[PDB]
Ligand binder design. Structure first.
Ligand code: PLP
Ligand code: PLP
Ligand code: ICC
Ligand code: ICC
Lengths: 426, 422
């Protein structure tokens, strides 16, 4: 009878990543509306896909006009204007050069896979560098180089809070890179996949200067540098593109989630020679469909019009300030990290040992949900709270979210172990 | 203010291009695409079958606008949402079905087929697969994976081992199964009309028989209806023409009526075997879901399978008259508004007329008609228009098609060469 019960009866568990019985019938701004009418503040923004929140007027206007008069449904066998305009608008925002082209997909998973397959096709080099704990996607293609393909080389992420080999600079990781590359035929690696802030590892910001150095090693060895900005892309970091923080430019940019503002849309920006090496090669019927592309353009126009990078920078300091405020009261909070409106809070059993508090995290978000706050956890040990709110979230929503979060830290023990065991999580 | 098609060449890479002619679209209304210059073309492609309701259908506009205005979140991964749930129930209500099956939502047929295969392997441990030569299950690593028993599709127009019944294919199947351990094959993937093969309807009874053999061996029958499902065949589900019910149904293309939306209908045990297993962030998103609902609602409301059956016969009847005037036409085939026309150099030899097929669609494009070719040989014109296409739209496209056949020589080899196509 209830919506959550019906979901359990109609929809298989295969795609479920449930942390609590959240059941939604509506949305407005940064709020989700449960079946009964209860309002929750969404600090997850659907893992960041709701870039402009819910029922944003520019999304509404864009998608309504597109549905009323659609330019076909595909970029495969026809050129259509909404996609071409979006392709140029994405091209404009990327420097460079360039000589760069767009590939459109439905998701970050299909875009990382396309990027990979295009590289191997264009160059003949199938080897891949990727980072341990990396999330590039859940398709057979994009999982092949995600964290736990042949010629896959996995490196530790430069994690300040848990430095590899207890070297805080990351120099040991670059040294490992170097040892790994010479154990392998010269010119055999075609690509290096990089998250500028590592999402699934625990929203990890790498040590300053590391990515630039890593890219320089890559460029010196013929290896194309692929920046996977699905989670942290497009203004979320407080800059239009997250690599703008790291003093390097990737050869390839992968975009997703927030790009569609609520509709399935991803994109690969890659040199022309990579995307033109084949035709009819990586394709799905509704790729570059006009409704998705229209929304994508409404996201970009709104980013520019509202200076959303500047907003995300502002609202992110406000959010991190408040979280530090909570640390001063709650011993579980070991680490606050992030850029713009991509923030992570690591919870630990002891601030010195920095041992992961998995059970408390699960109870926390469950309680948070009961109080009216949607937040999910992420990370290797399930101990990292992830904050990726709509970029249009108001300061008033953030204050309210902080009060509810404070309340959820205090009221955590209320959650029984059997309530938590109802929900498999990751 | 360059040409739209030229702007396309400069911004968008070749990787996903399946281009046969310089079609550049700025609008759509019903079964008509509107090019940049304001010429309306009758769409016989319906975007490879995705535009099931055509362009600007009121039901899609109303549902999409309302969904955009008040979205129940953006995902089904981490929240339950009402539109996704309502649509899941509706799809299960359309299948038999009750309490045995569940729904998994995707973006596309490729991911839906990939999810079905991964779920089966995970649930049953049986990784072995049966599939048909020339099959199209999608264009991702996961969906092009299909260890493998490959069979010829039973094509009445091109029999296997000199057996038009198709019974030699059932015999080969029996041999391959006997040759490999019992319980090593988990799944059989079938198109009930083979799309990439060139819209081939198999001989009567073959698939029913094929399904028996599979169940006899503990093998799940997966019916891939991404192209040909949802009212398109003259029934809601194409397997209803075939006298069997599959264990798993894959749906896509027309399902979103223009948005990306796919679905797997599978036994609960297959879909409940693991969690956080096969998932992408925008899966089950409410804007696609609402669009799926509008499609299912319109199918029932404007009796679209019956309309497809009517308009299909009228289309194929018209093409048989073209065959009386144009010797190129060798076989007209299909169910409902999913039709194929195989073009041959001799009707007895059945030798494929590839070169002439390319010119035909290029020519037809110039005339105001959107239509494409498929098949291993590049000689089968696919007809998959909006289920909404009008009786007037059909007659009008038949005249243009007639005119296209008469004017093939007007299109040169150098014009054909400018477009890479397949
Ligand atoms: C979410 C994500 C993906 C995959 O996108 P989907 O839409 O879930 O397929 C890939 N890479 C990163 C870094 C992501 O965050
Ligand atoms: C189109 C199609 C697919 C794949 O759908 P995409 O959206 O192109 O990935 C799979 N099977 C059949 C029969 C199809 O027609
Ligand atoms: O059937 C088709 C044509 C091939 C490209 C993918 C869309 N679907
Ligand atoms: O980072 C995430 C969580 C895993 C499910 C896909 C959405 N993105």
């Amino acid at each position: 009878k209830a919506l959550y019960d019906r979901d359990g009866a109609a929809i298989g568990n295969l795609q479920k990543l449930r942390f609590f019985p959240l059941a939604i019938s509506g949305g407005r701004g940064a709020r989700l509306i449960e079946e009964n009418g209860r309002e929750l503040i969404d600090l997850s923004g659907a893992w960041g896909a709701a870039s402009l929140g819910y029922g944003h007027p520019a999304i509404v206007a864009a998608v309504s006009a597109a549905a009323a008069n659609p330019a076909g449904a595909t970029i495969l066998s026809a050129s259509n204007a909404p996609a071409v305009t979006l392709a140029e608008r994405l091209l404009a925002s990327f420097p460079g050069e360039g000589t760069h082209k767009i590939w459109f997909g439905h998701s970050g998973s299909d875009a990382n896979e396309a990027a990979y397959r295009a590289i191997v096709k264009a160059t003949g080099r199938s080897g891949v560098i990727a980072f341990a704990g990396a999330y590039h996607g859940c398709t057979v293609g994009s999982m092949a180089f995600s964290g736990h393909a042949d010629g896959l080389i996995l490196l530790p992420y430069p994690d300040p809070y848990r430095p590899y080999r207890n070297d805080p600079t990351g120099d040991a990781i670059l040294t490992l890179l170097t040892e790994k590359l010479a154990a392998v035929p010269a010119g055999s690696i075609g690509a290096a996949f990089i998250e500028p802030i590592q999402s699934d590892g625990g929203l990890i910001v790498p040590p300053d200067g590391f990515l630039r150095k890593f890219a320089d090693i890559c460029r010196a060895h013929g290896i194309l540098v692929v920046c996977d900005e699905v989670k942290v892309g497009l203004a979320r970091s407080g800059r239009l593109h997250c690599f703008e923080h790291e003093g390097f430019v990737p050869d390839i940019l992968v975009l997703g989630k927030g790009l569609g503002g609520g509709l399935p849309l991803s994109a690969v920006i890659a040199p022309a020679e990579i995307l033109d090496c084949a035709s009819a090669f990586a394709m799905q019927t509704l790729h570059g469909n006009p409704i998705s592309a229209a929304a994508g353009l409404a996201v970009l126009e709104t980013i520019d019009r509202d200076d959303l990078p500047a907003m995300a920078e502002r609202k992110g300091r406000l959010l991190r300030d408040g979280l530090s405020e909570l640390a001063k009261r709650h011993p579980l909070i070991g680490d606050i990290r992030g850029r713009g409106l991509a923030c992570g809070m690591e919870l630990v059993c002891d601030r010195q040992s920095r041992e992961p508090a998995r059970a408390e995290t699960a109870k926390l978000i469950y309680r948070a949900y009961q109080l009216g706050l949607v937040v999910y956890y992420v990370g290797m040990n399930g101990n990292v709270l992830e904050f990726t709110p709509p970029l249009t979230i108001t300061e008033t929503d953030i204050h309210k979210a902080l009060d509810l979060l404070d309340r959820a830290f205090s009221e955590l023990s209320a959650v029984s172990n059997e309530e938590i065991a109802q929900f498999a999580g990751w």
